[PDB]
């Protein structure tokens, strides 16, 4: 089941993972609409793109890459929600279509 929302599981997350880091690496793949980072048990993030085609370009380009050398290995799958709900813009969540 394809989706415009991707789930990033960041293996060996040695460095700080923020919305600015994820926006930086994802938006060249395809336009990013929203980001939500979960920090409870490792680091997983949901990244919502403008379209399925952009999400598929992000998945094809980044799956199995390292954000930084030797760590932060990306496992990328389609997320369950088809849209993200964001109510605040900070280092953990951001909506690039809703400045607050």
């Amino acid at each position: 089941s394809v989706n415009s929302v991707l789930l990033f599981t960041i293996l060996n997350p040695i460095y700080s993972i923020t919305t600015d880091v994820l926006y930086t690496i994802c938006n060249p793949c395809g336009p990013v609409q929203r980001i939500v980072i979960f920090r409870k048990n490792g680091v997983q993030a949901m990244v919502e793109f403008d379209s399925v085609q952009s999400a598929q370009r992000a998945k094809a380009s980044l799956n199995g890459a390292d954000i930084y050398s030797g760590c932060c290995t990306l496992k990328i799958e389609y997320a369950k929600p088809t849209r993200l709900n964001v109510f605040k813009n900070d280092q953990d969540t951001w909506d690039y279509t809703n400045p607050n």
């Binding site: 930086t24 980044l62 930084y68």
Partner: peptide, 26 residues
């Protein structure tokens, strides 16, 4: 985007994103 990145450390014929490094180290 940081010059030179994403950087392909090596090319693995089995896996196009193995060896790919998205950003320089903080």
């Amino acid at each position: 985007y940081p010059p030179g990145y994403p950087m392909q450390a090596y090319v693995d014929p089995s896996n196009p994103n193995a060896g790919k490094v998205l950003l320089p180290t903080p």
